[PDB]
A paper describes a structure:
In all species, ribosomes synthesize proteins by faithfully decoding messenger RNA (mRNA) nucleotide sequences using aminoacyl-tRNA substrates. Here we combine single-molecule imaging and cryogenic electron microscopy methods to examine the molecular basis of human ribosome fidelity to reveal that the decoding mechanism is both kinetically and structurally distinct from that of bacteria. Although decoding is globally analogous in both species, the reaction coordinate of aminoacyl-tRNA movement is altered on the human ribosome and the process is an order of magnitude slower. These distinctions arise from eukaryote-specific structural elements in the human ribosome and in the elongation factor eukaryotic elongation factor 1A (eEF1A) that together coordinate faithful tRNA incorporation at each mRNA codon.
Decoding was stalled in intermediate-FRET states by the slowly hydrolysing GTP analogue GTPγS, as expected for GTPase-activated (GA) states. SSU domain closure in the CR-to-GA transition locally remodelled the decoding centre to structure and enclose the codon–anticodon pair, engaging the universally conserved SSU rRNA ‘monitoring’ bases G626, A1824 and A1825 (G530, A1492 and A1493 in E. coli). Solvent exposure of the codon–anticodon pair was reduced by an outer shell of additional contacts, including the N-terminal portion of eukaryote-specific ribosomal protein eS30 and neighbouring rRNA nucleotides. The codon–anticodon pair also engaged elements of the post-transcriptionally modified H69 base Am3760 (A1913 in E. coli), which shifted from being solvent exposed in the CR complex to interacting with the post-transcriptionally modified position 37 of aa-tRNA in the GA complex immediately upstream of the anticodon. Immediately downstream of the last mRNA codon base in the A site, conserved loop elements of ribosomal protein uS12, including Ser64 and post-translationally hydroxylated cis-Pro62 residues, also reached into the decoding centre to stabilize stacking of SSU shoulder domain base C614 (C518 in E. coli) with monitoring base G626 through magnesium-ion coordination. Ternary complex movement towards the decoding centre in the CR-to-GA transition docked the conserved G domain and catalytic switch-II His95 residue of eEF1A tightly against the SRL. Focused refinement with signal subtraction on eEF1A in the GA structure revealed the catalytic geometry of the G domain, including density for a water molecule poised for GTP hydrolysis, and confident modelling of the sulfur position in GTPγS. This G-domain geometry agreed with that of the EF-Tu ternary complex stalled by GDPCP. We therefore conclude that GTPase activation in human also requires uncoupled ternary complex movements towards the decoding centre and the SRL to span the increased distance created by the unrolled SSU conformation.
Residue numbers in the entry:
A (entry chain SC): 59 to 280
B (entry chain SX): 2 to 72
C (entry chain SV): 1 to 83
D (entry chain Sb): 2 to 84
E (entry chain SW): 2 to 130
F (entry chain SR): 2 to 135
G (entry chain Sa): 2 to 100
H (entry chain Ln): 1 to 25
Write the structure that this text describes.
Amino acid sequence: EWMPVTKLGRLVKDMKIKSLEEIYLFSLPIKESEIIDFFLGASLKDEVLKIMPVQKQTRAGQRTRFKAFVAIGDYNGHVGLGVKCSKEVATAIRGAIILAKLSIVPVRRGYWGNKIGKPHTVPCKVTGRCGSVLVRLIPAPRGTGIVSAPVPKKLLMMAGIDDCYTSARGCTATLGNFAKATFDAISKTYSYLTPDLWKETVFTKSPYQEFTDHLVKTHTRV
Amino acid sequence: GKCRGLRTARKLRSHRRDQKWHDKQYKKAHLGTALKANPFGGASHAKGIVLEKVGVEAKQPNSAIRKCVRV
Amino acid sequence: MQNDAGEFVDLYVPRKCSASNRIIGAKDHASIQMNVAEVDKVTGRFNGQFKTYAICGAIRRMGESDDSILRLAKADGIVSKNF
Amino acid sequence: PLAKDLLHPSPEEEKRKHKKKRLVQSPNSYFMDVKCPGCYKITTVFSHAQTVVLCVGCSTVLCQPTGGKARLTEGCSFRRKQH
Amino acid sequence: VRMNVLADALKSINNAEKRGKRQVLIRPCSKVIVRFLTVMMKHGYIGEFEIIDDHRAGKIVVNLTGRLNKCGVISPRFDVQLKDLEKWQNNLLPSRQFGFIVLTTSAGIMDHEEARRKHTGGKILGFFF
Amino acid sequence: GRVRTKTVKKAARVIIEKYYTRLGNDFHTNKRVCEEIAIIPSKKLRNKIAGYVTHLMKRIQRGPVRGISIKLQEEERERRDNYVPEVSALDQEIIEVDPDTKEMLKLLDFGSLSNLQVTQPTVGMNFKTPRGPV
Amino acid sequence: TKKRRNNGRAKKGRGHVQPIRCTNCARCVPKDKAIKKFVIRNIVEAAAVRDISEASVFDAYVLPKLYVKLHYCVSCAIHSKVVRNRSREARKDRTPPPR
Amino acid sequence: MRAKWRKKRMRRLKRKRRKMRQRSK
Amino acid sequence: SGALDVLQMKEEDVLKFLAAGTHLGGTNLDFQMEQYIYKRKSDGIYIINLKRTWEKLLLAARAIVAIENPADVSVISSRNTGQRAVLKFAAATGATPIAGRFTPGTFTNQIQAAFREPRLLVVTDPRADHQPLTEASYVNLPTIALCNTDSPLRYVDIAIPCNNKGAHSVGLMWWMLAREVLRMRGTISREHPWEVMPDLYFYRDPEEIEKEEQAAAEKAVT
RNA sequence: GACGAUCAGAUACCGUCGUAGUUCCGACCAUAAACGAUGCCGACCGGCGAUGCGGCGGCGUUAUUCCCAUGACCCGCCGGGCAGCUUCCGGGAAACCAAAGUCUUUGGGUUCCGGGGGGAGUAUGGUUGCAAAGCUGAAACUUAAAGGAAUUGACGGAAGGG
RNA sequence: CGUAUGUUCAA
Ligand SMILES: [K+]
Ligand SMILES: [K+]
Ligand SMILES: [K+]
Ligand SMILES: [Mg+2]
Ligand SMILES: [Mg+2]
Ligand SMILES: [Mg+2]
Ligand SMILES: [Mg+2]
Ligand SMILES: [Mg+2]
Ligand SMILES: [Mg+2]
Ligand SMILES: [Mg+2]
Ligand SMILES: [Mg+2]
Ligand SMILES: [Mg+2]
Ligand SMILES: [Mg+2]
Ligand SMILES: [Mg+2]
Ligand SMILES: [Mg+2]
Ligand SMILES: [Mg+2]
Ligand SMILES: [Mg+2]
Ligand SMILES: [Mg+2]
Ligand SMILES: [Mg+2]
Ligand SMILES: [Mg+2]
Ligand SMILES: [Mg+2]
Ligand SMILES: [Mg+2]
Ligand SMILES: [Mg+2]
Ligand SMILES: [Mg+2]
Ligand SMILES: [Mg+2]
Ligand SMILES: [Zn+2]
């Protein structure tokens, strides 16, 4: 069924690449939603945050289109947010789900103050900005749960975060910007230099050179 | 910007005291004029005598005769 | 990230820019990891070993990726010290 | 240039930079040995002199104040002093 | 005028750090600056630095290792008691796993964790993480 | 109002690339060719395509055009490759250099070791165009 | 919304610039804001220049030119089509139109 | 109403009010 | 050149660079190209340092050789003065050339007809070929460029300081790059001069073509 | 203000006159979209071409008749300034801004000042002023928006092309 | 040269 068009999609289907983190490690642009479905197909859960109609004024009247905000993610270190606007509600939701999968980022989880057990919270205080909305993720004591509005609480649970204090500033009624700001906060957990990431990086082989021979054999024909 | 020196507690206290008069929620409850002008005089309820029955025309974009009484 | 025990609990360990030492994020599509092959001392011909440098998108945007790579090569001996 | 060596800038770089903005401030002025065509004795004159320096006894003008370095009188040879 | 040499120094380091520079010139220099820099050095947030003598306040050149997220000063130097130290940590540091609050105490200039160990409160100077 | 729509033009350019050799400057012959090498559902459309083909052929025969034609192709390869001069333009008996790069070549330890002549440096450094409007 | 960085005028490092009167309507306009146009043209138009040539008493008499400096207020400059409205980015262009 | 003329309206109103009190004092 | 005598600049190369005018840059200097110049001439012309030209040229060659599949290297020249030089390089090294107009979306539009995913990009001029350099920024594409003294270095990882303006110098620089790539690969001998003439990469304007073809024609007839 | 036009009216726009004023001197007045609608002092943070002032350096041209210096020009550097272009520095609701940046990773110092729209800069008391007014400055009551920036349309007695 | 206006609510 799935005929990949990109080299990354080709390697994923040929089972040459294992785990999304190898793609994440080299920050490769994913361009096929089947790659996401290949690695996390069973565990992903989707939710329609909001169906927001938008209108364009024309001579004959108002051209109403529907925008769908979809949050995707397995409840374990991966979450994605997708926004799609189209004439039909059903078409908008499907397109948003595709865009949500393409946008999935890895979520770094840390420890409040113990380092006992698996990670339960954000590694540190992270802030996300989208328009006027500022969402600040705060590390929380184990057993605290997620103290946030219903909108970021869905994303934070989908990110796998179990405990988190939060602080929102701006027009949080703008659910599109509110959700995006939360997603931006979650995204930059792995962009934050904690001293445990200080140790010199060891460079591994890029998938485009590690399987450069397989790509020549197959992707040239396919 | 605002002063931050370690010996500016009086200036910060004085400024917040002055600027607290500029929100109507505080000035309503702390000037006394509002309580003097309040027909209930700071009470939740009040008794009275019906002087007459009057009809009030509802504001646009509605249309109706709201039934009221002068008390 | 390791717990008190020392088991690695991070999903993965992101790369860091070879010049600015900033973490290269999962969506930093302007980042590169360019390999510079090392020649044989006498032949001057690719022997199969390469030096690896990673540059974050921000350094490339500033236009500083040129001197970062050049300075890294001089440190690695790829470029002659009398450049 | 991200990696600029601030400890050891080139002498050309320091010579261009403003005297106060150098790594360690130093004057751009100097003292000089002025010999008027007459007599034989030597006069020590500041480069950026503000007063009309007279060769005492000879009673001749050696330099004229300006907005910067003093202008030596015509026929007067000067040599920079060293400390 | 310049009311706080430490504020000027920490801001200058913070700006060069964000700009990806490898070295930053710090002027003027003070014992409080050098002691503050040493606290960051002992934790690896900065490399070696060389104080430069000009028969004046002094200049410093710090080698930056690309590890600082932010080195900020706190003005004014509030008095910090040991009981109130925790509430300062929750307000100034991203997490307890890393980041330090630099205190000037009678024992000497030290980070917040060393002050807790030596049971000494003091006046807050700044922070870094 | 005789501008030809994309459908007339797309058919005509393609026919000349595909069957250039069998075409010519006569509308009447080209009209007949289109009847067998193409399926043109209407006669009027056929005469319009053959009209543009005839117009193109003249142009494709007096120069290259958007359309490709082997004969013009095989010449492009010949200029791009075949003209390698007998002696390179770089092979010059005397190479003129200014004392500035001559002293540079001294740093290159290649100054006096080459066959090159030094010109007198330019005087006045009047190299900037005068500033002003227009 | 600010429309022009220079506020529509050439005043940058001073407080007050003396006004001048518009050539058409005599409106007071600051000298730095007036749309100026230095007009140089022959006294005789190109149609009549030939007739004056053989009507002249000199063998080679060069026709004197007319030098008039016009100052226009914004309304008169726009109305007389000396200047026109331009797009957001076209406004920023400052070079005079080509000759 | 233009703010400048609303100001002029009130200035005239004030002048009338001051004349009304200068007549009663 | 790794301070190796086998990779040092020969007297033959010096005469080639001097003849083609590669050492002469523009009258304007980019602040990030300052390290490559030697001295400004008395006529405002900046002189490029040939050692630094050679070092970056070999450093670029080492980057090209590191790509296992030569087809994964893309060579581009929007300007005509360099279209012939690039296609030859692609014929001699097996790179994928794009001469002429670069259609936007080539590296980013997965469903575009000419969609391609090179592992390394080489361009003739950052100003003229600004589209591939800017577009490479979306797909993690390292970039090599021929940069003059007044050339921007944004998204340019290996800049070769050379006169990328004159017809001779542009062709010569691609010729030297192609020769050095093959020598490192071992395709051609190093002590034996290359069979390909430098003039084969030189762009020839039409006026010269008809001028020389009739000169050759009159030579043959008599 | 008078008048002549224009108009349904025209206490206006247009035109003909024309008082105060406009001008100088001396005393008041203290307000302006008094605007960069952007406090001041200090530090840091990209690039580029200019520009004005000062100084320093350097082929050459020109006058100073030759020399000398000095000016005019040319190529740079430094410092203080009015600005300009560019930039994914970074910021911002955006327009934009190299400051309006170095802000949830929130603290250099310090002054003034705003807290939904009105009522209202009104009343009233004080004070200043010859006056006009300036400064200080409320309340009752009323109201679910008022407003900013930007988008698409529609419209225009706006422009350009059909 | 020279003209003004368009009852209330309602997609
Ligand atoms: K200047
Ligand atoms: K509009
Ligand atoms: K109604
Ligand atoms: Mg309130
Ligand atoms: Mg009603
Ligand atoms: Mg109703
Ligand atoms: Mg407007
Ligand atoms: Mg503007
Ligand atoms: Mg103007
Ligand atoms: Mg009348
Ligand atoms: Mg008159
Ligand atoms: Mg005022
Ligand atoms: Mg003014
Ligand atoms: Mg104001
Ligand atoms: Mg003052
Ligand atoms: Mg000046
Ligand atoms: Mg604040
Ligand atoms: Mg209010
Ligand atoms: Mg009053
Ligand atoms: Mg309502
Ligand atoms: Mg307003
Ligand atoms: Mg009416
Ligand atoms: Mg009606
Ligand atoms: Mg109506
Ligand atoms: Mg209806
Ligand atoms: Zn006018």
